[PDB]
Design a binder for these strands. Structure first.
Ligand code: FES
Ligand SMILES: [K+]
Ligand SMILES: [K+]
Ligand SMILES: [K+]
Ligand SMILES: [Mg+2]
Ligand SMILES: [Mg+2]
Ligand SMILES: [Mg+2]
Ligand SMILES: [Mg+2]
Ligand SMILES: [Mg+2]
Ligand SMILES: [Mg+2]
Ligand SMILES: [Mg+2]
Ligand SMILES: [Mg+2]
Ligand SMILES: [Mg+2]
Ligand SMILES: [Mg+2]
Ligand SMILES: [Mg+2]
Ligand SMILES: [Mg+2]
Ligand SMILES: [Mg+2]
Ligand SMILES: [Mg+2]
Ligand SMILES: [Mg+2]
Lengths: 128, 72, 86, 137, 74, 97, 48, 117, 122
RNA sequence: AAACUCCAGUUGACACAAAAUAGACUACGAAAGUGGCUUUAACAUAUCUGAACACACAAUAGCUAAGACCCAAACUGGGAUUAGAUACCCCACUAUGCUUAGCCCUAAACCUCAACAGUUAAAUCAACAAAACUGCUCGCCAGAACACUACGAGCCACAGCUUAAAACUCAAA
């Protein structure tokens, strides 16, 4: 996970954020935010690391990255909430929709399909 | 009609005239219609601002002796 | 039990008129729905039965308010016949 | 001053008095109007019991207790024992929707007591214990 | 009914016929029974109001068509 | 073509939409004075929107604030706080004949 | 603009240095969140 | 304001489950219900219970209970006439908002139209 | 996030109330909170009797603490307040000033529902 | 009538139960379900349809084990009614409804109205119900009864569940 001192995605590119008081840096960091703010930072890191255009969010690559971050959040949720049937369904459906994205990415752009698998640590498996 | 915008503003600013409509007279002119005709005349003289074209119209009628009691 | 007493559901009597004070209290408890609530709570109303009662009461309100709205709308026409004989 | 149906609030300075006593000092007539009986207890402002009467203690039995006239008789009996102890004005606190809900109050008046206020304390659970199952009749 | 008197007079003045009253079932489609086998029906029916007093089409509109009588109507 | 023909546009005489008395105002659970204006004086029962005249959004805001304030120790449940009985009457209900 | 506004507010935040002084200052003051609404939509602040 | 009916009934196009399950079509009839006779109750029992109290203390001797007896007698007479009064005013509609008979003639003139003509 | 601690304290003298507030604000800071303000709402009669720590209370001092803290501090602070014998009732809510009120154009009227029943003659 | 009379009424202390009013709102969730308060996490899919060969869920009741226990309450006992009363009515009380950990996998689980896209014109249209239709796709149906049955198979299910026939019979249903 990103360090708690990491600034929010909205306040990371404001001019002069490095010279503000330490208290102001704590209030604009992940430590003082909800987990959804930490997930936006994770999604941003994966985009720059994998996709050629980190600003295109509608490409099949970005969707696989966006959905992969949601999947990891559900897995962490269910690690603490093992009888949460609602989120267990969301996890299984999300895994099924990422496989459908990876299938369509493999069929259209194999070189990008390989970078998505390496970048996200996904082992593509053919259905039985 | 285009004048309906002028009538809506006139009724908001000055309300309905205390003069009574006579819908039997086919050539009846109300205070609102008199306001609309003056407002149209001044627009044809080249004025194009709306808030300015509305204040000058009220003054013209007051000069002619018309009673315009603002509602508020 | 933890609240202050003689504030809730309390009506003062005027000039010894206890009947009017009781009628006011009964009117207060009725309008706030307490009297009907107390009665429905004497025996357990199963949820299926409660949902049916609420549906019936809500449909009755809509019908009754719409019929009343039509009665008030048409009442002006209850005037004497202007064209009697034709 | 205009009449206020809202009771005087304790701790504030009201001008209302009954025999020189403040609202907080007037004894309380507790009427429990049940479906098959009516119980009346008069207590002082300090919660000292002064008189008790019910339809059963007035010689009514079985279904006759669950009548208006049975509660009225209980009210007169409680008023008589309370009047001997110095009670004139009472605050009425009635809990229950039984047939003697109003009749019990009449008996208190016919017995010589003056009701200055009426309070309903019928227990209404806000969600509470499950009541008994409906009757097939 | 506001114009029953006016319309009845207009018909009499022009030498024609008016029916402004309650329209009984079968005046047109059962005229021979009601009036007689030799009764002559109207050649033209003019409706100054086409609706009855419950805001429905006047029954004679349908019955005029059944008897193949042309109708003028406001 | 013809100058006197009607023109397409939006209703110029359309009246502004009506607003609830709390439109644009913040409903806080700590403002027991405001919340008390929407409960019964005798029973503390929350008034329905047909009595309060509030829109759906503010009827919910008032309801949620009352329930929060009651259990957090700010507002009584079984009666209206007598301190607030002389506040403006904004609800459409009369209990005296 | 939000970082600037926030940078000024932090000057008035409570710290372990001014904690005792801010507590005593709070005990002397009073904050009132009560106000009433009228049928006309007007706020009626309390009489204080 | 009448409660809303939008999205309340089970219908094609309505995604949510039905809010209302009317057993009768929500369509205004051309008639109102008939004035429902109110449940009668025993009356004058308060006066009846003062008369029967003196008797118990005076061995059922009418000479000692004259004032209480005359009260109960008058109270019954008033309730007997009161029923005669109410009945007349009920039929006349002197106090009623309107008579179901009069209110139905008015609806006959403006019948609800659930169909096209 | 930004939270609001609604704190009802046992009715005490000024010295014991200041010690309780300082002890409570330090507990927030020990859990990583950034305390923004402290507001006194005044001592008043409670809306009802509250039993807390084997005692019955009828009056209390109402205080507010506006502060920022990590999400994990809320659960840990709630546990702290449950053990403080000078606290009658303490609740932590999300600060109401964070929620921005959407603009409202007004009341959109609802027309009577139409075409609920076929127009066939019944 | 039986029942209680260490009972009843006032006051005070006092929940592993349930959640008035708001709600005349019609929201959330795949459905089942969800209407006291707070906080944390959190509500898949940037074409659609699509698994009865899988996976994950699924009210109430029920099973296994350990707890809680206000109230309600199958069964059972008593009272009453009755020709009888294995009922309806009254009282008492248990399993059970609650929590934890595992099972069971069923409902008129029905809003008996499939998903997605689109239309209101033509013939509007058996009847009733909740107006009539188009495109596309999956699932399902083909006289009644036998039959939510038999056998086989699968299953933590052992008086269970799912899948599910045939013979004889009828001219109807
Ligand atoms: S009408 Fe705008 S918030 Fe109520
Ligand atoms: K409700
Ligand atoms: K509740
Ligand atoms: K159904
Ligand atoms: Mg569709
Ligand atoms: Mg039906
Ligand atoms: Mg699909
Ligand atoms: Mg289940
Ligand atoms: Mg169970
Ligand atoms: Mg029990
Ligand atoms: Mg048990
Ligand atoms: Mg529970
Ligand atoms: Mg269901
Ligand atoms: Mg089905
Ligand atoms: Mg499907
Ligand atoms: Mg068959
Ligand atoms: Mg079965
Ligand atoms: Mg089987
Ligand atoms: Mg088998």
């Amino acid at each position: 996970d990103p360090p708690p001192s990491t600034l929010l995605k909205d306040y990371q590119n404001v001019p002069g954020i490095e010279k503000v008081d330490d208290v102001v840096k704590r209030l604009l960091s992940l430590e003082m935010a909800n987990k959804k703010e930490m997930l936006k930072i994770k999604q941003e890191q994966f985009m720059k690391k994998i996709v050629a255009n980190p600003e295109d969010t509608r490409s099949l690559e970005a969707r696989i990255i966006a959905l992969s971050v949601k999947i990891r959040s559900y897995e962490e949720h269910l690690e603490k909430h093992r009888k949460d049937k609602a989120h267990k369904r969301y996890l299984l459906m999300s895994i099924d929709q990422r496989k459908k994205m990876l299938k369509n990415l493999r069929n259209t752009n194999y070189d990008v399909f390989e970078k998505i698998c390496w970048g996200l640590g996904i082992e593509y498996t053919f259905p039985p | 009609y285009h004048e309906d915008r002028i009538r809506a503003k006139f009724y908001s600013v000055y309300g309905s005239g205390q003069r009574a409509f006579d819908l039997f007279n086919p050539n009846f002119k109300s205070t609102c219609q008199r306001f609309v005709e003056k407002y149209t005349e001044l627009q044809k003289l080249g004025e194009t601002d709306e808030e300015k074209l509305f204040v000058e119209t009220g003054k013209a009628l007051l000069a002619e002796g018309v009673i315009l009691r603002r509602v508020g | 039990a933890k609240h202050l007493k003689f504030i809730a559901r309390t009506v003062m009597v005027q000039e010894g008129n206890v009947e009017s004070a009781y009628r006011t209290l009964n009117r207060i408890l009725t309008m706030d729905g307490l009297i009907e609530d107390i009665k429905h709570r004497r025996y357990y109303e199963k949820p299926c039965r409660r949902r049916q009662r609420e549906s019936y009461e809500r449909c009755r309100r809509i019908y009754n308010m719409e019929m009343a709205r039509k009665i008030n709308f048409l009442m002006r026409k209850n005037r004497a016949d202007p064209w009697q004989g034709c | 001053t205009k009449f206020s149906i809202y009771p005087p609030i304790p701790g504030e300075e009201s001008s209302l008095r009954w025999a020189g006593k403040k609202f907080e000092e007037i004894p309380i007539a507790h009427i429990k109007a049940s479906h098959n009986n009516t119980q009346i207890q008069v207590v002082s402002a300090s919660n000292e019991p002064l008189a008790f009467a019910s339809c059963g203690t007035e010689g009514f039995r079985n279904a006759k207790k669950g009548t208006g006239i049975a509660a009225q008789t209980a009210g007169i009996a409680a008023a008589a024992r309370a009047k001997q102890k110095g009670v004139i004005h009472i605050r009425v606190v009635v809990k229950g929707l039984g047939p003697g809900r109003l009749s019990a109050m009449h008996g208190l008046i016919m017995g010589g007591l003056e009701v200055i206020s009426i309070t309903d304390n019928t227990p209404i659970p806000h969600x509470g214990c499950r009541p008994r199952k409906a009757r097939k009749l | 009914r506001q114009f029953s008197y006016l319309i009845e007079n207009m018909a009499r003045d022009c030498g024609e016929y008016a029916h402004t009253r309650y329209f009984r079932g079968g005046m047109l489609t059962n005229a021979r029974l009601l009036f007689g086998p030799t009764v002559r029906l109207p050649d033209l029916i003019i409706f100054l109001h086409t609706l009855n007093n419950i805001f429905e089409p006047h029954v004679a509109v349908r019955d005029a068509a059944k008897m193949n009588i042309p109708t003028v109507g406001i | 073509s013809n100058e006197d023909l009607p023109i397409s546009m939006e209703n110029p005489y359309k009246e502004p939409l009506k607003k609830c008395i709390l439109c644009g105002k913040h409903v806080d659970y700590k403002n027991v004075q405001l919340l008390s204006q929407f409960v019964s004086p005798f029973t503390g029962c929350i008034y329905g929107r047909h009595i309060t005249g509030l829109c759906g959004k503010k009827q919910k805001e008032i309801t949620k604030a009352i329930k929060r304030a009651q259990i957090m120790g700010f507002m009584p449940v079984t009666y209206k706080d007598p301190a607030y009985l002389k506040d403006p009457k904004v609800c459409n209900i009369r209990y005296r004949e | 603009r939000e970082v600037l506004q926030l940078q000024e507010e932090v000057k008035n935040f409570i710290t372990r240095e001014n904690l005792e002084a801010r507590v005593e200052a709070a005990l002397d003051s009073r904050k009132n969140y009560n106000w009433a609404i009228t049928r006309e939509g007007l706020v009626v602040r309390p009489q204080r | 304001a009448t409660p809303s009916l939008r999205g309340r009934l089970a219908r094609f196009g309505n995604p949510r489950k039905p809010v209302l399950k009317p057993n009768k079509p929500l369509i205004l009839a051309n008639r109102v219900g008939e004035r429902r006779r109110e449940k009668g109750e025993a009356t004058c029992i308060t006066e009846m219970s003062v008369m029967m109290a003196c008797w118990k203390q005076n061995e059922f001797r009418d000479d000692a209970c004259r004032k209480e007896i005359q009260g109960f007698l008058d109270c019954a007479a008033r309730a007997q006439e009161a029923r005669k009064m109410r009945s007349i005013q009920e039929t006349l509609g002197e106090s009623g908002s309107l008579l179901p008979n009069k209110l139905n003639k008015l609806l006959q003139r403006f019948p609800n139209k659930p169909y096209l003509s | 996030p930004r939270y609001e601690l609604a704190l009802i304290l046992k009715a005490m003298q000024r010295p014991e109330t200041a010690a309780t507030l300082k002890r409570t604000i330090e507990a927030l800071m020990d859990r990583g909170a950034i305390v923004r303000d402290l507001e006194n709402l005044g001592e008043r009669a409670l809306p009802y009797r509250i039993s807390a720590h084997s005692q019955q209370h009828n009056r209390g001092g109402y205080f507010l603490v506006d502060f920022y803290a990590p999400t994990a501090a809320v659960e840990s602070m709630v546990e702290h307040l449950s053990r403080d014998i000078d606290v009658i009732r303490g609740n932590i809510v999300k600060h109401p000033l964070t929620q921005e009120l959407k603009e409202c154009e007004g009341i959109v009227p609802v027309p009577l529902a139409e075409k609920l029943y076929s127009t066939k003659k019944r």
